[PDB]
Amino acid sequence: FTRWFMSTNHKDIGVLYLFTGGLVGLISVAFTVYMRMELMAPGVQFMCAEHLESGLVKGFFQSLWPSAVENCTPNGHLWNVMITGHGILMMFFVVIPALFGGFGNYFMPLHIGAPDMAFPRMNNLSYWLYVAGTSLAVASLFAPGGNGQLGSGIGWVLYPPLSTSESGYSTDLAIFAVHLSGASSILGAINMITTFLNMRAPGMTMHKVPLFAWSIFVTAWLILLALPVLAGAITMLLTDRNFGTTFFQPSGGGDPVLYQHILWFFGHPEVYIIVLPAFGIVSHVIATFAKKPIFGYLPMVYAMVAIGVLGFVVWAHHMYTAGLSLTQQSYFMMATMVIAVPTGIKIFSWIATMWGGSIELKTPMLWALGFLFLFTVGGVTGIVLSQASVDRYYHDTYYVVAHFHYVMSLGAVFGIFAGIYFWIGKMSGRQYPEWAGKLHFWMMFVGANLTFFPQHFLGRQGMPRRYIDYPEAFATWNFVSSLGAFLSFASFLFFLGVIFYTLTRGARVTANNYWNEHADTLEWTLTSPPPEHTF
Amino acid sequence: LEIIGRPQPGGTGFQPSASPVATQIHWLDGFILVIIAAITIFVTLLILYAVWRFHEKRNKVPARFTHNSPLEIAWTIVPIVILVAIGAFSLPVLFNQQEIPEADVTVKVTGYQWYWGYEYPDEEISFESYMIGSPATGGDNRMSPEVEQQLIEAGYSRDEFLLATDTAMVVPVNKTVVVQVTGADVIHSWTVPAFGVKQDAVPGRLAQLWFRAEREGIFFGQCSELCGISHAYMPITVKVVSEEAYAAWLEQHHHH
Ligand code: HEA
Ligand code: HEA
Ligand SMILES: CCCCCCCCCCO[C@@H]1O[C@H](CO)[C@@H](O[C@H]2O[C@H](CO)[C@@H](O)[C@H](O)[C@H]2O)[C@H](O)[C@H]1O
Ligand SMILES: CCCCCCCCCCO[C@@H]1O[C@H](CO)[C@@H](O[C@H]2O[C@H](CO)[C@@H](O)[C@H](O)[C@H]2O)[C@H](O)[C@H]1O
Ligand SMILES: CCCCCCCCCCO[C@@H]1O[C@H](CO)[C@@H](O[C@H]2O[C@H](CO)[C@@H](O)[C@H](O)[C@H]2O)[C@H](O)[C@H]1O
Ligand SMILES: CCCCCCCCCCO[C@@H]1O[C@H](CO)[C@@H](O[C@H]2O[C@H](CO)[C@@H](O)[C@H](O)[C@H]2O)[C@H](O)[C@H]1O
Ligand SMILES: CCCCCCCCCCCCC
Ligand SMILES: CCCCCCCCCCCCC
Ligand SMILES: CCCCCCCCCCCCC
Ligand SMILES: [Ca+2]
Ligand SMILES: [Cu+]
Ligand SMILES: [Cu+]
Ligand SMILES: [Cu+]
Ligand SMILES: [Mg+2]
């Protein structure tokens, strides 16, 4: 049965990515639960230096039960390790593998009428590089790291000199993990682009390609430019750490800010790489359940292309307090505001698609509508942040954390859930139970809002990012945020229950198209699941 | 001195303003907040209306349109107009922030793992500033009876734990303070929310910020770039005082 892992079929590779992204997602979400346990109340109660004296297993277990402050020596290194771990897993080993590696590999060839990807053996290799990258990232958490403990306490973006002076080799492992992720993504992108250009079915013209396939195509191009730049940035960290270079060390004439320019040159595209496939999925879902063709097909394609392109010229909005000149700050502010227009516009198109439709509120549609709301709430705080004068106050506070969890983290996640409920019958031959779909949606929707909305208040009140502990006054909204996270976690465990139920005993799917005629792309003309060899 | 620059329990707004730059931030944010709350309510009411009005039970046959030129014109221009209006108010504020005026008082701040060093080059005064409760003051970064005792002795209370430092940066009211910020080891970030200022403390670079404090009191900030194990434990206390009290403070540091 472990002939799953040696398969080169785009459908099998897609399923492997979805399950793996899901499992890594579970691990990273569990890190957020522990994080929110410690942030639930001021004073440190869980992350005690005393737990280090115990074994690896025994220490782990004591750390899940609160201690009195008087018996708990605060261990800031563990906080920093956990949040670094949370961030890296999500940005490299969860959502892109799920969306691009998972749904991208499964569905893009189906959508364009291609039998398989241009280079199936390379596709299989991309999966194994993802797995190897994940393995190294996780290994780094248990490798000798900063402050004579395990793991790297350095932030998902690895700013030097902190990243370059962190002791042990945990950080070098993290850097190798990111190289492997980049390689996986680049192979994926090469496959996606080659297939999309060369292997469309006869009659499948550029203007007839479904929006999801377009979203994967644009995403693939962002990856080819962004990921090699990141490869440079982190290799330069690796050489500062191990091979005597001083790219980012002032003693040798280096500039730590140089790293930031290079990192964020990857870093901004990265967030659009995350969200573009979600845009694709939202378009398919809304068109289906509104029973109405997508409003402005060509503007949707062009908006995506434009966003993709402009996403390469805004990076320094992540650097407004880093020591940028007034001219630089002003330019990046204007460039950021411009890209806001096509991005924010797409919300109007999705609403226009619903408008005058015949709307069914099945689970996938609920996720899509949740996406529109959360992406809007997140997008508008982006507008606030773009204004450098106001970012002066918000930068490196929880207001930014609230922003990107709304716009990016929940955007991607609601996109993922929309896809899973939309397509699980197609992929598996079994249908999810509708009442459980909806219960998942409402628990998650309420949970996510309780988690992140109060973080805007923490940020306005000046709570910094990356803090194990905080002044008493921040207690109320931290407590509410943590209750939200615990409810979101419950909803995710319920989801995993729903998926287990669906795949083992869900109602048999009998129809090729178990939705309606307005799901009008090619996968809905095939059986459920599709034939081994399609087209 | 009144404790002014601090978070308050259950707060949802900004910390109080104590500079003209902070006031400008509060106004600009308040202006953008109205717009974005309107946009968000608008989008939300549209979604909810569309779902009610065009539910499959209420609208049985779906329309097929994919264009509406007047609407697509309007919904493109309006966002462009909104952003220009914001930029028009926002850029002058940015210019006011980043154009460093002539200093009445000059302080050079250096971030270290994990404390701040302050130097007043005109006064030949220099000192380090540690969290009350850090290992420097005999603690291990948590509340304890000893820590509460030290807070009280320094003129604070239990409530200022994590904010209060053993020594403060002291400046006179209604004077232009220019702060030169750098880092010694890794990147730190120096900030006071009540003044509307924040500047990364980057090794190898000296960057400047300014503020003019418009009232006397105590104002706190916290290190705003992750810098390792005690990032959460290296805050900033600024004491804004009368010209005379500032002079008195200076003379106390003068060696005869
Ligand atoms: C999905 C990914 C995603 C998206 C789409 C966005 C969208 C936007 N982002 Fe966000 N951003 C992130 C992911 C994303 N961001 C991440 C991960 C970070 C920080 C990472 C880290 O530090 O760890 C970040 C941080 C970040 C910063 C730096 C903050 C700081 O660290 O101090 C800034 C500053 O400009 C910014 C701005 C914007 C803007 C203006 C938009 C706009 O494009 C949004 C467009 C606006 C909307 C969608 C609103 C709805 C609009 C309409 C309905 C109609 C249009 C109306 C108008 C334009 C008025 N973002
Ligand atoms: C996609 C990206 C993503 C996602 C999904 C999340 C999810 C969550 N994040 Fe994360 N977060 C980041 C990206 C993300 N985060 C990043 C990059 C940082 C910065 C790290 C740094 O400082 O360096 C950060 C930082 C960060 C902080 C601030 C840490 C600090 O400054 O000290 C907090 C605080 O509460 C937090 C909380 C949460 C919570 C409670 C959740 C969730 O529990 C919310 C509830 C959501 C769910 C329960 C759904 C989970 C579903 C999936 C993940 C899909 C899995 C795949 C399949 C099913 C196929 N995150
Ligand atoms: C399916 C979802 C599963 C998610 C898991 C959720 C786990 C919930 C853990 C709650 O435990 C609480 O933790 C607090 C610590 O934050 C303690 O605070 C109390 O005790 C502390 C000392 O331990 C004091 O310092 C605090 O001030 C005092 O309020 C409190 O007693 C304890 O009940
Ligand atoms: C670890 C996290 C824990 C998460 C919390 C889990 C809470 C689950 C509640 C279970 O209650 C369920 O409610 C459903 C809804 O009422 C019932 O379906 C029933 O009702 C539906 C009505 O819409 C019908 O469609 C179904 O056929 C019918 O079985 C179902 O039997 C019942 O067990
Ligand atoms: C951490 C784990 C958390 C728990 C996760 C579990 C989530 C999945 C539970 C699905 O629940 C099933 O839903 C079916 C679909 O609604 C019900 O079929 C019921 O309704 C059908 C449709 O009317 C009938 O034909 C069936 O006979 C009748 O049993 C069935 O009873 C119920 O058990
Ligand atoms: C900024 C916020 C925007 C959020 C989006 C929600 C608004 C969407 C409203 C769409 O308006 C409809 O557009 C149709 C197409 O333009 C018009 O059909 C007209 O034109 C069609 C041909 O395209 C004909 O079939 C119809 O009979 C004729 O009424 C129709 O009157 C009009 O109500
Ligand atoms: C006085 C002690 C209060 C007991 C609360 C214990 C918290 C249990 C947390 C365990 C959850 C694991 C994820
Ligand atoms: C099928 C009827 C279900 C009850 C109505 C639910 C309203 C759906 C609103 C979801 C939008 C979330 C922003
Ligand atoms: C639509 C996103 C809004 C996020 C910002 C919420 C802040 C509101 C608090 C205002 C209270 C000031 C006194
Ligand atoms: Ca705590
Ligand atoms: Cu960005
Ligand atoms: Cu620091
Ligand atoms: Cu710091
Ligand atoms: Mg920063």
Side-chain angles (χ1 to χ4, degrees), chain A residues 42-43 48 50 64 68 104 114 123 141 152 175 180 244 246 254 256 271 281 301 356 395 430 468 483 493 501 503 527:
Chain A
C48 314
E50 288 82 6
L64 271 1
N123 206 14
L141 298 170
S152 301
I175 291 160
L180 295 174
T246 60
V271 315
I281 295 171
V301 181
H395 175 74
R430 292 200 182 262
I468 187 171
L483 290 182
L493 294 177
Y501 177 90
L503 297 179
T527 53

PDB file of all heavy atoms in Angstrom, chain A residues 42-43 48 50 64 68 104 114 123 141 152 175 180 244 246 254 256 271 281 301 356 395 430 468 483 493 501 503 527:
ATOM      1  N   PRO A  42      -1.474  37.096  32.321  1.00  0.00           N
ATOM      2  CA  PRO A  42      -0.161  37.682  32.611  1.00  0.00           C
ATOM      3  C   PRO A  42       0.600  36.861  33.666  1.00  0.00           C
ATOM      4  O   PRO A  42      -0.006  36.103  34.442  1.00  0.00           O
ATOM      5  CB  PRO A  42      -0.508  39.090  33.118  1.00  0.00           C
ATOM      6  CG  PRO A  42      -1.934  38.938  33.681  1.00  0.00           C
ATOM      7  CD  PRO A  42      -2.576  38.014  32.689  1.00  0.00           C
ATOM      8  N   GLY A  43       1.928  36.980  33.667  1.00  0.00           N
ATOM      9  CA  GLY A  43       2.770  36.089  34.438  1.00  0.00           C
ATOM     10  C   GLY A  43       2.995  34.828  33.630  1.00  0.00           C
ATOM     11  O   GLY A  43       2.120  34.421  32.856  1.00  0.00           O
ATOM     12  N   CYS A  48       8.289  27.238  31.981  1.00  0.00           N
ATOM     13  CA  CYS A  48       9.166  27.356  33.146  1.00  0.00           C
ATOM     14  C   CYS A  48      10.511  26.712  32.864  1.00  0.00           C
ATOM     15  O   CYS A  48      10.568  25.584  32.347  1.00  0.00           O
ATOM     16  CB  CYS A  48       8.520  26.673  34.361  1.00  0.00           C
ATOM     17  SG  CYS A  48       6.758  27.058  34.634  1.00  0.00           S
ATOM     18  N   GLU A  50      12.326  25.418  35.019  1.00  0.00           N
ATOM     19  CA  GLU A  50      12.310  24.201  35.838  1.00  0.00           C
ATOM     20  C   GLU A  50      11.981  22.923  35.054  1.00  0.00           C
ATOM     21  O   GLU A  50      12.450  21.841  35.418  1.00  0.00           O
ATOM     22  CB  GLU A  50      11.352  24.340  37.023  1.00  0.00           C
ATOM     23  CG  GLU A  50      11.850  25.285  38.139  1.00  0.00           C
ATOM     24  CD  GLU A  50      11.592  26.752  37.845  1.00  0.00           C
ATOM     25  OE1 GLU A  50      10.927  27.061  36.829  1.00  0.00           O
ATOM     26  OE2 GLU A  50      12.050  27.609  38.635  1.00  0.00           O
ATOM     27  N   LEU A  64       2.532  21.341  30.264  1.00  0.00           N
ATOM     28  CA  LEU A  64       1.118  21.485  29.877  1.00  0.00           C
ATOM     29  C   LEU A  64       0.199  21.817  31.041  1.00  0.00           C
ATOM     30  O   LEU A  64      -0.992  22.067  30.847  1.00  0.00           O
ATOM     31  CB  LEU A  64       0.612  20.229  29.154  1.00  0.00           C
ATOM     32  CG  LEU A  64       0.731  20.049  27.631  1.00  0.00           C
ATOM     33  CD1 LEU A  64       1.411  21.190  26.896  1.00  0.00           C
ATOM     34  CD2 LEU A  64       1.439  18.747  27.326  1.00  0.00           C
ATOM     35  N   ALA A  68       2.364  27.941  39.714  1.00  0.00           N
ATOM     36  CA  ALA A  68       2.375  29.265  40.335  1.00  0.00           C
ATOM     37  C   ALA A  68       3.588  30.026  39.815  1.00  0.00           C
ATOM     38  O   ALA A  68       4.618  29.415  39.519  1.00  0.00           O
ATOM     39  CB  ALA A  68       2.432  29.147  41.858  1.00  0.00           C
ATOM     40  N   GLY A 104      -3.677  22.262  -6.373  1.00  0.00           N
ATOM     41  CA  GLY A 104      -2.986  22.578  -7.620  1.00  0.00           C
ATOM     42  C   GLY A 104      -2.639  21.325  -8.416  1.00  0.00           C
ATOM     43  O   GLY A 104      -3.033  21.214  -9.570  1.00  0.00           O
ATOM     44  N   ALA A 114      -5.562  18.175 -19.193  1.00  0.00           N
ATOM     45  CA  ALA A 114      -4.272  17.506 -19.288  1.00  0.00           C
ATOM     46  C   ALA A 114      -4.310  16.186 -18.530  1.00  0.00           C
ATOM     47  O   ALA A 114      -4.840  16.131 -17.421  1.00  0.00           O
ATOM     48  CB  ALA A 114      -3.166  18.404 -18.737  1.00  0.00           C
ATOM     49  N   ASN A 123       7.516  15.747 -10.241  1.00  0.00           N
ATOM     50  CA  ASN A 123       6.416  16.001  -9.317  1.00  0.00           C
ATOM     51  C   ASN A 123       6.542  15.139  -8.068  1.00  0.00           C
ATOM     52  O   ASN A 123       6.441  15.650  -6.940  1.00  0.00           O
ATOM     53  CB  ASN A 123       5.072  15.776 -10.006  1.00  0.00           C
ATOM     54  CG  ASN A 123       3.938  16.582  -9.379  1.00  0.00           C
ATOM     55  OD1 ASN A 123       4.159  17.510  -8.596  1.00  0.00           O
ATOM     56  ND2 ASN A 123       2.714  16.244  -9.753  1.00  0.00           N
ATOM     57  N   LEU A 141      13.920  21.834  16.019  1.00  0.00           N
ATOM     58  CA  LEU A 141      13.262  22.092  17.297  1.00  0.00           C
ATOM     59  C   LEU A 141      13.882  21.274  18.415  1.00  0.00           C
ATOM     60  O   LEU A 141      13.777  21.647  19.584  1.00  0.00           O
ATOM     61  CB  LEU A 141      11.760  21.772  17.226  1.00  0.00           C
ATOM     62  CG  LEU A 141      10.854  22.544  16.268  1.00  0.00           C
ATOM     63  CD1 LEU A 141       9.472  21.871  16.220  1.00  0.00           C
ATOM     64  CD2 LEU A 141      10.731  24.012  16.677  1.00  0.00           C
ATOM     65  N   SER A 152      15.608  27.051  17.600  1.00  0.00           N
ATOM     66  CA  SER A 152      16.005  28.402  17.215  1.00  0.00           C
ATOM     67  C   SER A 152      14.940  29.422  17.611  1.00  0.00           C
ATOM     68  O   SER A 152      13.811  29.337  17.119  1.00  0.00           O
ATOM     69  CB  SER A 152      16.206  28.482  15.694  1.00  0.00           C
ATOM     70  OG  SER A 152      17.190  27.570  15.235  1.00  0.00           O
ATOM     71  N   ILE A 175      17.544  26.502   8.194  1.00  0.00           N
ATOM     72  CA  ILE A 175      17.914  27.060   6.883  1.00  0.00           C
ATOM     73  C   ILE A 175      17.891  25.951   5.807  1.00  0.00           C
ATOM     74  O   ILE A 175      17.424  26.175   4.703  1.00  0.00           O
ATOM     75  CB  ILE A 175      19.331  27.729   6.898  1.00  0.00           C
ATOM     76  CG1 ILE A 175      19.350  29.011   7.744  1.00  0.00           C
ATOM     77  CG2 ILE A 175      19.849  27.990   5.468  1.00  0.00           C
ATOM     78  CD1 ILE A 175      20.794  29.434   8.196  1.00  0.00           C
ATOM     79  N   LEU A 180      15.054  23.186   1.066  1.00  0.00           N
ATOM     80  CA  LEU A 180      14.283  22.031   0.588  1.00  0.00           C
ATOM     81  C   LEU A 180      12.834  22.393   0.239  1.00  0.00           C
ATOM     82  O   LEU A 180      12.315  21.957  -0.800  1.00  0.00           O
ATOM     83  CB  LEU A 180      14.331  20.888   1.608  1.00  0.00           C
ATOM     84  CG  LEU A 180      15.710  20.276   1.848  1.00  0.00           C
ATOM     85  CD1 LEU A 180      15.703  19.236   2.980  1.00  0.00           C
ATOM     86  CD2 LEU A 180      16.238  19.660   0.571  1.00  0.00           C
ATOM     87  N   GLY A 244      32.720  32.234   7.487  1.00  0.00           N
ATOM     88  CA  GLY A 244      33.499  33.462   7.640  1.00  0.00           C
ATOM     89  C   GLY A 244      33.084  34.711   6.881  1.00  0.00           C
ATOM     90  O   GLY A 244      33.784  35.730   6.927  1.00  0.00           O
ATOM     91  N   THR A 246      30.753  38.118   6.163  1.00  0.00           N
ATOM     92  CA  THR A 246      30.172  39.132   7.028  1.00  0.00           C
ATOM     93  C   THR A 246      29.205  40.008   6.235  1.00  0.00           C
ATOM     94  O   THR A 246      29.230  41.240   6.348  1.00  0.00           O
ATOM     95  CB  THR A 246      31.265  40.023   7.703  1.00  0.00           C
ATOM     96  OG1 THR A 246      32.044  40.680   6.692  1.00  0.00           O
ATOM     97  CG2 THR A 246      32.190  39.200   8.596  1.00  0.00           C
ATOM     98  N   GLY A 254      29.403  44.674   6.888  1.00  0.00           N
ATOM     99  CA  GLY A 254      28.062  44.229   6.484  1.00  0.00           C
ATOM    100  C   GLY A 254      26.955  45.108   7.030  1.00  0.00           C
ATOM    101  O   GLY A 254      27.202  45.988   7.861  1.00  0.00           O
ATOM    102  N   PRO A 256      22.931  44.531   8.415  1.00  0.00           N
ATOM    103  CA  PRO A 256      21.802  43.657   8.729  1.00  0.00           C
ATOM    104  C   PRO A 256      20.552  44.010   7.932  1.00  0.00           C
ATOM    105  O   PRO A 256      19.758  43.115   7.640  1.00  0.00           O
ATOM    106  CB  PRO A 256      21.570  43.906  10.227  1.00  0.00           C
ATOM    107  CG  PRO A 256      22.906  44.326  10.754  1.00  0.00           C
ATOM    108  CD  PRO A 256      23.466  45.180   9.635  1.00  0.00           C
ATOM    109  N   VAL A 271       3.265  35.940   0.466  1.00  0.00           N
ATOM    110  CA  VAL A 271       1.880  36.019   0.954  1.00  0.00           C
ATOM    111  C   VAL A 271       0.858  35.903  -0.180  1.00  0.00           C
ATOM    112  O   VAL A 271      -0.234  35.363   0.027  1.00  0.00           O
ATOM    113  CB  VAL A 271       1.603  37.268   1.889  1.00  0.00           C
ATOM    114  CG1 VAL A 271       2.730  37.438   2.912  1.00  0.00           C
ATOM    115  CG2 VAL A 271       1.363  38.555   1.084  1.00  0.00           C
ATOM    116  N   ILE A 281     -10.127  28.942  -5.943  1.00  0.00           N
ATOM    117  CA  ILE A 281     -11.136  28.134  -5.270  1.00  0.00           C
ATOM    118  C   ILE A 281     -12.409  28.924  -4.939  1.00  0.00           C
ATOM    119  O   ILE A 281     -13.503  28.451  -5.220  1.00  0.00           O
ATOM    120  CB  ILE A 281     -10.561  27.445  -3.996  1.00  0.00           C
ATOM    121  CG1 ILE A 281      -9.469  26.429  -4.378  1.00  0.00           C
ATOM    122  CG2 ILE A 281     -11.679  26.799  -3.197  1.00  0.00           C
ATOM    123  CD1 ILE A 281      -8.695  25.849  -3.185  1.00  0.00           C
ATOM    124  N   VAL A 301      -8.803  37.388 -14.141  1.00  0.00           N
ATOM    125  CA  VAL A 301      -7.490  36.934 -14.612  1.00  0.00           C
ATOM    126  C   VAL A 301      -6.457  38.081 -14.554  1.00  0.00           C
ATOM    127  O   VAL A 301      -5.344  37.899 -14.044  1.00  0.00           O
ATOM    128  CB  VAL A 301      -7.530  36.353 -16.060  1.00  0.00           C
ATOM    129  CG1 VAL A 301      -6.139  35.868 -16.480  1.00  0.00           C
ATOM    130  CG2 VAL A 301      -8.521  35.213 -16.168  1.00  0.00           C
ATOM    131  N   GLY A 356     -28.168  38.482  -7.993  1.00  0.00           N
ATOM    132  CA  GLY A 356     -29.094  37.972  -9.003  1.00  0.00           C
ATOM    133  C   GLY A 356     -29.009  36.468  -9.213  1.00  0.00           C
ATOM    134  O   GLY A 356     -29.560  35.934 -10.175  1.00  0.00           O
ATOM    135  N   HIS A 395       3.654  48.945  13.954  1.00  0.00           N
ATOM    136  CA  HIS A 395       4.676  47.980  13.562  1.00  0.00           C
ATOM    137  C   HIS A 395       5.194  47.208  14.770  1.00  0.00           C
ATOM    138  O   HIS A 395       5.490  47.803  15.828  1.00  0.00           O
ATOM    139  CB  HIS A 395       5.855  48.625  12.829  1.00  0.00           C
ATOM    140  CG  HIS A 395       6.949  47.645  12.532  1.00  0.00           C
ATOM    141  ND1 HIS A 395       6.840  46.698  11.539  1.00  0.00           N
ATOM    142  CD2 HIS A 395       8.124  47.398  13.162  1.00  0.00           C
ATOM    143  CE1 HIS A 395       7.920  45.933  11.538  1.00  0.00           C
ATOM    144  NE2 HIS A 395       8.713  46.324  12.526  1.00  0.00           N
ATOM    145  N   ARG A 430     -16.750   9.540  -1.665  1.00  0.00           N
ATOM    146  CA  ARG A 430     -17.588   9.635  -0.480  1.00  0.00           C
ATOM    147  C   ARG A 430     -17.897  11.080  -0.110  1.00  0.00           C
ATOM    148  O   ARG A 430     -17.037  11.958  -0.212  1.00  0.00           O
ATOM    149  CB  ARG A 430     -16.926   8.934   0.699  1.00  0.00           C
ATOM    150  CG  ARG A 430     -16.846   7.410   0.543  1.00  0.00           C
ATOM    151  CD  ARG A 430     -16.656   6.780   1.880  1.00  0.00           C
ATOM    152  NE  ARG A 430     -16.533   5.337   1.817  1.00  0.00           N
ATOM    153  CZ  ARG A 430     -17.532   4.494   2.045  1.00  0.00           C
ATOM    154  NH1 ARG A 430     -18.748   4.950   2.342  1.00  0.00           N
ATOM    155  NH2 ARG A 430     -17.314   3.185   1.969  1.00  0.00           N
ATOM    156  N   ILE A 468       6.704  36.514  25.424  1.00  0.00           N
ATOM    157  CA  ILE A 468       6.208  35.434  26.303  1.00  0.00           C
ATOM    158  C   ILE A 468       5.220  35.930  27.391  1.00  0.00           C
ATOM    159  O   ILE A 468       4.362  35.175  27.887  1.00  0.00           O
ATOM    160  CB  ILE A 468       7.387  34.676  26.963  1.00  0.00           C
ATOM    161  CG1 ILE A 468       6.898  33.442  27.742  1.00  0.00           C
ATOM    162  CG2 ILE A 468       8.291  35.634  27.825  1.00  0.00           C
ATOM    163  CD1 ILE A 468       8.011  32.544  28.236  1.00  0.00           C
ATOM    164  N   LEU A 483      -9.433  32.123  24.585  1.00  0.00           N
ATOM    165  CA  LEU A 483     -10.680  31.348  24.526  1.00  0.00           C
ATOM    166  C   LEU A 483     -11.100  31.110  23.080  1.00  0.00           C
ATOM    167  O   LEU A 483     -11.517  30.016  22.733  1.00  0.00           O
ATOM    168  CB  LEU A 483     -11.820  32.027  25.310  1.00  0.00           C
ATOM    169  CG  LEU A 483     -11.788  32.097  26.842  1.00  0.00           C
ATOM    170  CD1 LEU A 483     -13.065  32.781  27.326  1.00  0.00           C
ATOM    171  CD2 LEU A 483     -11.642  30.732  27.499  1.00  0.00           C
ATOM    172  N   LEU A 493     -10.393  19.816  15.546  1.00  0.00           N
ATOM    173  CA  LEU A 493     -10.501  18.407  15.967  1.00  0.00           C
ATOM    174  C   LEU A 493     -11.831  17.762  15.492  1.00  0.00           C
ATOM    175  O   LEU A 493     -11.862  16.590  15.102  1.00  0.00           O
ATOM    176  CB  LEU A 493     -10.381  18.275  17.499  1.00  0.00           C
ATOM    177  CG  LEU A 493      -9.052  18.624  18.195  1.00  0.00           C
ATOM    178  CD1 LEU A 493      -9.214  18.481  19.709  1.00  0.00           C
ATOM    179  CD2 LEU A 493      -7.892  17.755  17.708  1.00  0.00           C
ATOM    180  N   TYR A 501     -14.749  10.283   9.454  1.00  0.00           N
ATOM    181  CA  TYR A 501     -16.092   9.794   9.147  1.00  0.00           C
ATOM    182  C   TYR A 501     -16.343   9.715   7.631  1.00  0.00           C
ATOM    183  O   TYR A 501     -16.740   8.664   7.123  1.00  0.00           O
ATOM    184  CB  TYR A 501     -17.174  10.668   9.803  1.00  0.00           C
ATOM    185  CG  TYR A 501     -18.577  10.228   9.430  1.00  0.00           C
ATOM    186  CD1 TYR A 501     -19.253   9.280  10.198  1.00  0.00           C
ATOM    187  CD2 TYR A 501     -19.206  10.721   8.289  1.00  0.00           C
ATOM    188  CE1 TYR A 501     -20.540   8.853   9.848  1.00  0.00           C
ATOM    189  CE2 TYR A 501     -20.491  10.291   7.925  1.00  0.00           C
ATOM    190  CZ  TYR A 501     -21.143   9.355   8.717  1.00  0.00           C
ATOM    191  OH  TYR A 501     -22.399   8.921   8.379  1.00  0.00           O
ATOM    192  N   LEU A 503     -14.353   9.638   5.019  1.00  0.00           N
ATOM    193  CA  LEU A 503     -13.518   8.731   4.238  1.00  0.00           C
ATOM    194  C   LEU A 503     -13.747   7.262   4.574  1.00  0.00           C
ATOM    195  O   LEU A 503     -13.470   6.397   3.746  1.00  0.00           O
ATOM    196  CB  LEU A 503     -12.033   9.098   4.368  1.00  0.00           C
ATOM    197  CG  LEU A 503     -11.590  10.466   3.833  1.00  0.00           C
ATOM    198  CD1 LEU A 503     -10.087  10.664   4.084  1.00  0.00           C
ATOM    199  CD2 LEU A 503     -11.913  10.634   2.351  1.00  0.00           C
ATOM    200  N   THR A 527     -15.894  10.636 -13.475  1.00  0.00           N
ATOM    201  CA  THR A 527     -16.494   9.877 -12.377  1.00  0.00           C
ATOM    202  C   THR A 527     -15.947  10.379 -11.039  1.00  0.00           C
ATOM    203  O   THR A 527     -15.028  11.193 -11.010  1.00  0.00           O
ATOM    204  CB  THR A 527     -16.206   8.365 -12.503  1.00  0.00           C
ATOM    205  OG1 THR A 527     -14.801   8.178 -12.654  1.00  0.00           O
ATOM    206  CG2 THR A 527     -16.932   7.754 -13.734  1.00  0.00           C
TER     207      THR A 527
END
